Amino acid sequence: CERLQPGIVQNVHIPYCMTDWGGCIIQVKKRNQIEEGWQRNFLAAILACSQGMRLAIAVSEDVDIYSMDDIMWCLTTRVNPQTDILNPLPGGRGQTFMPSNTQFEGGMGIDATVPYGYESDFHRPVYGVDLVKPENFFDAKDIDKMKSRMAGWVLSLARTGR
Amino acid sequence: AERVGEKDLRAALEWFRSKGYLVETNKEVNPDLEITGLQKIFDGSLPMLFNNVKDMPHARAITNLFGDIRVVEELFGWENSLDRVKKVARAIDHPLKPVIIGQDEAPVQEEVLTTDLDVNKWLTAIRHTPLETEMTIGSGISCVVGPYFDGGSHIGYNRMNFRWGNVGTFQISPGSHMWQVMTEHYKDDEPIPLTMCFGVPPSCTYVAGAGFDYAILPKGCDEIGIAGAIQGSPVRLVKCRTIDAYTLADAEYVLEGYLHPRDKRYETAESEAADIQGRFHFHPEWAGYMGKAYKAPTFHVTAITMRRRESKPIIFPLGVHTADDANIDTSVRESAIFALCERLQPGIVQNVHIPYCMTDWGGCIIQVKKRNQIEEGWQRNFLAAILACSQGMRLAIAVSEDVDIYSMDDIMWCLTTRVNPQTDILNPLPGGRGQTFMPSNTQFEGGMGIDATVPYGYESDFHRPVYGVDLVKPENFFDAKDIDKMKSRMAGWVLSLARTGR
Amino acid sequence: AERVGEKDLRAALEWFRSKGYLVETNKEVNPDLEITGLQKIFDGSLPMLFNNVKDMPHARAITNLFGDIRVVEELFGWENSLDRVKKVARAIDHPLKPVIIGQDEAPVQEEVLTTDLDVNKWLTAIRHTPLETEMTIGSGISCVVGPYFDGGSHIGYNRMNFRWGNVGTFQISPGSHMWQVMTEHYKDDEPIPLTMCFGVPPSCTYVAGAGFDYAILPKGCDEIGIAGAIQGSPVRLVKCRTIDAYTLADAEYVLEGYLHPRDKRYETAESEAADIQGRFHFHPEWAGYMGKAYKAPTFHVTAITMRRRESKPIIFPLGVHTADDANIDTSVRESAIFALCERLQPGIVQNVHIPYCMTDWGGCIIQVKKRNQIEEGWQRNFLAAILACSQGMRLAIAVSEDVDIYSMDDIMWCLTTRVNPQTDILNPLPGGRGQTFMPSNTQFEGGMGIDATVPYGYESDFHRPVYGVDLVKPENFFDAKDIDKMKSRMAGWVLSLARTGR
Numbered sequence A: 001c002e003r004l005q006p007g008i009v010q011n012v013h014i015p016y017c018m019t020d021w022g023g024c025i026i027q028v029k030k031r032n033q034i035e036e037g038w039q040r041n042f043l044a045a046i047l048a049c050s051q052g053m054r055l056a057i058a059v060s061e062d063v064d065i066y067s068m069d070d071i072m073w074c075l076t077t078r079v080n081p082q083t084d085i086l087n088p089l090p091g092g093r094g095q096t097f098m099p100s101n102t103q104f105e106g107g108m109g110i111d112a113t114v115p116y117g118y119e120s121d122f123h124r125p126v127y128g129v130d131l132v133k134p135e136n137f138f139d140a141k142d143i144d145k146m147k148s149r150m151a152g153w154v155l156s157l158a159r160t161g162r
Numbered sequence B, C: 001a002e003r004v005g006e007k008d009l010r011a012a013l014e015w016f017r018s019k020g021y022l023v024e025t026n027k028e029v030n031p032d033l034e035i036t037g038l039q040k041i042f043d044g045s046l047p048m049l050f051n052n053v054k055d056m057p058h059a060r061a062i063t064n065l066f067g068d069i070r071v072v073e074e075l076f077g078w079e080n081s082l083d084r085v086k087k088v089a090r091a092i093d094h095p096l097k098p099v100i101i102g103q104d105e106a107p108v109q110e111e112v113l114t115t116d117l118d119v120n121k122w123l124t125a126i127r128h129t130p131l132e133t134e135m136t137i138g139s140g141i142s143c144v145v146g147p148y149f150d151g152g153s154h155i156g157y158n159r160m161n162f163r164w165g166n167v168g169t170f171q172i173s174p175g176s177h178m179w180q181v182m183t184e185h186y187k188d189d190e191p192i193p194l195t196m197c198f199g200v201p202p203s204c205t206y207v208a209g210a211g212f213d214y215a216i217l218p219k220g221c222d223e224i225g226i227a228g229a230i231q232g233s234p235v236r237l238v239k240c241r242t243i244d245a246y247t248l249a250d251a252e253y254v255l256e257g258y259l260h261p262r263d264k265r266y267e268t269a270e271s272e273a274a275d276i277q278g279r280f281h282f283h284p285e286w287a288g289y290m291g292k293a294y295k296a297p298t299f300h301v302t303a304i305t306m307r308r309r310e311s312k313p314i315i316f317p318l319g320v321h322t323a324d325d326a327n328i329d330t331s332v333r334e335s336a337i338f339a340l341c342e343r344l345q346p347g348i349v350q351n352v353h354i355p356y357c358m359t360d361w362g363g364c365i366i367q368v369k370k371r372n373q374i375e376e377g378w379q380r381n382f383l384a385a386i387l388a389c390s391q392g393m394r395l396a397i398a399v400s401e402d403v404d405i406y407s408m409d410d411i412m413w414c415l416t417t418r419v420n421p422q423t424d425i426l427n428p429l430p431g432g433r434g435q436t437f438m439p440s441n442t443q444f445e446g447g448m449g450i451d452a453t454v455p456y457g458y459e460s461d462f463h464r465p466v467y468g469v470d471l472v473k474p475e476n477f478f479d480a481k482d483i484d485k486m487k488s489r490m491a492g493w494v495l496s497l498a499r500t501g502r
């Protein structure tokens, strides 16, 4: 992605849950109007140059790329099911382990990014987690009792305030 | 001398003190950007009680009450989330008839105010994000009992903005239960009398978030009938002092008055100066975005009835991108989707989960089990029926029985491996009715039904292998210092995979 | 001496004699190819009563009882088909509790036979088409009351073929109410006791045809509760003499016994010699095709209880491609689709019509009315919800309010003019569950939701102009000889267009 157009893709994460060569998540940042639409060129190039990728997801810069509940939040809210799902190579070469054309269905490029210029309509609001301090209200026994029940998406959302 | 509720918020607060789940403080918290700021730090955690609220000498504030779902399930006597879904959907089909008590026995009618009705003097308005301009009351559920709901009852949250004293805006989402009352009585000369209740019993907080499941709970159903059947005792109602309606008797604050559908005003002042709709911020919305201000109808308060101010009545302010708002809105909706799938063909759907990450009405995950060849393909009938009967669902995912439905990395594993992108993606209603908050046909794109299930008979090719996590014991190899050092670095998908051995 | 039913078939036959709607004869009709042959000649017409049936010295036969819908609506006190749909859907939500009378007061238990149970000796089997090989009993509805239907009740038709004396086949369509009882108690060692009733009251004939509408009438509902609420009086039940179940007391013949789900036999002899399924004819089916013979479960009759043979008890044989079979199967299904659309968003759908030409469960036509901009697009939510909650619907059409919903040339006019072929054709569930009779996914193609409605705000461009058929009078220009000569050549779309002036 830095070879094709540099400065757009900020982070690439492949987790445990997308197997070895099953999928990937990239994170793009659109600086202007010309760079809008470059992430669809990235998802077609990732799914073609990697053999047997089935799920390439492009997300925007305000997403935690390691929190996997944040990726499902972008699939719910930022995905048009008619336009933002790519099937670039239907009948190409996939992987025969994981169940003029073959039986490979094509892969899935999912554009969960925001459009450029519509960032104000899609802006995630930030709560005041830095304007208040929890040490002024509770003692340290009550903080560690309350912080020990937090797991999953709430550890990522309490850090960013999102 | 003093009246006591049956299963109200004060009895639930004493139960949290016995189990050690209640965290209290006496420092003066701010309603401006400190209640929801502390709620976001401790999202999905223990209930926090604020005894001292700034410029609120009689009000107490509870927050994060529905944060952890393990203490909501311990409150109502449920073992897990699978026992929670199957018992509320049992309680939907058998509602309990609510009782009506006298006006001298209702604890919410201890202090009845009929003049100088300043609602911001008595009810606590909060501010969520620092980009807001206005202070928003959003702690009240709307109790409509009687002939305006066809002999049934309705409870559900509505946000307010009191800017003209006793008159404030009343935001109704379109297609809801309050929208169906308002479109029926739009051209009526008489106003609609309703009652907004604050500091409700937590069974009535539970059914308050149920909405857009109207094939199961239609207009004319008993929404406080389900709240009676969840707690096991019928909810006490009482007649209003001024208007001809009914309240919830075991609440803390009750607003009585009339709703004017034709009288519409702007929610914010800066959207009232520039008279447009849909671009100016009010507070955040249910999607994790900002809601915008619109031309909401007006609720004209005629009376404020409230408990005794020396006993310090409790309000429940909550943020909208919190796990309170997830576990209120999506908890009966897990059961109502499970009730719809058991209505269509029973015995197939095992579990329905709606997490925090699929917003309120954004999506759902169901879990099916195909017993034979005839039941194969029934999950595509379920995903089309879920996406049509729930207004504004965008992502319904059906998974098989060998998937952890609560681990969200396990759902992404089914999207990678078990989904054909040509056949297993459903777009059932392209151009139908969606939700206008979350961005002969409309602009709605249709929703997405994703069939991540295995085919019947191909279960051996799609079987997840199980490692021997029960054939070996780690206590025979390492000491207990080395186990807890090694178990403390495990988070995410590896906690689910080490339990099942998958 | 003699027991009298409340609202049974004998009381309905006396009401048809008073209005002149009953046509009787004393010639000996044949059950082989003469009852259904005379039913097809007079399809959609007056009820025909056969006093003498060949090789049936105690049986009387009524046919074409539900043929004309204008005399079904006159029987139950309904003005038209719009009043029929809105009152049965009212009666779905308020069922009447059926009463239980004693065994000495039930008229169907006058003659109880427990030995030499030859069902073809007493119950009339008919043959529809000349390509058949076997004689089929298909006049009985299946009454399951009690713990096998979760405290509710179920009535519905099932075909039989008694070939082994008291043992005959019992065809259950998959996904039905009897299929859900059978899949629950498939591995049970005890058999399922049910009761097949013949010569039922016509309110119980009316709800018998209701099926695959299980979001409205699920398992555990009261299907004889709706039959009590249609006729206005509760249906009398009585305990069986041998088995532990309940019958309908005001019937003419009742078969009592047990259903064996694991014991399965072939329906025909020629499909039993060559042991395949799905190619050999049994009788025609509901689609207007032939049904094929399969491996049906067996109903083991233990007792035959019947009225007194000198009083000549009445059976109701009917063809399956007749207007009896259309107006039995699609009449509560018109109301249940109307109940589902009023559950989702009320006030939009005005009328639901399922004609003869869309078979039983093949299709439906709804009629919507868009009041404002918010209600635009709600009919695509309706067509996706109708096609998913009804199993095996293939053609759901939504039309606007200026269409005659009963004139079928007016529906083809909306397919020509108001349908975009790119946007207004819905395929909601491609690969789901359909019907195997009518020819991770199945072979079902998905159904077809057709949006033939106008957009909101474009009603002036799509307005049908109205000619002046009321501003002129034809009696001022022609005599009454010339009017009735000119009006007798009008049939089809021109009868609907001359009434509305359209």
Ligand SMILES: [Fe+3]
Residues within 6 Å of the ligand: A013, A014, A015, A016
């Ligand atoms: Fe990695």
Ligand SMILES: [Fe+3]
Residues within 6 Å of the ligand: A078, A079, A080, A084, A111, A112, A113, A114, A115
């Ligand atoms: Fe996108």
Ligand SMILES: [Fe+3]
Residues within 6 Å of the ligand: B154, B155, B156, B177, B178, B223
């Ligand atoms: Fe409601």
Ligand SMILES: [Fe+3]
Residues within 6 Å of the ligand: B326, B327, B330, B331, B334, B353, B354, B355, B356
């Ligand atoms: Fe939830």
Ligand SMILES: [Fe+3]
Residues within 6 Å of the ligand: B418, B419, B420, B424, B451, B452, B453, B454, B455, C440
């Ligand atoms: Fe699949």
Ligand SMILES: [Fe+3]
Residues within 6 Å of the ligand: C154, C155, C156, C177, C178, C223
């Ligand atoms: Fe039934």
Ligand SMILES: [Fe+3]
Residues within 6 Å of the ligand: C326, C327, C330, C331, C334, C353, C354, C355, C356
């Ligand atoms: Fe019909």
Ligand SMILES: [Fe+3]
Residues within 6 Å of the ligand: B440, C418, C419, C420, C424, C451, C452, C453, C454, C455
């Ligand atoms: Fe159209």
Ligand SMILES: [K+]
Residues within 6 Å of the ligand: B155, B156, B157, B207, B208, B209, B210, B211, B223
């Ligand atoms: K609600």
Ligand SMILES: [K+]
Residues within 6 Å of the ligand: C155, C156, C157, C207, C208, C209, C210, C211, C223
């Ligand atoms: K039926």
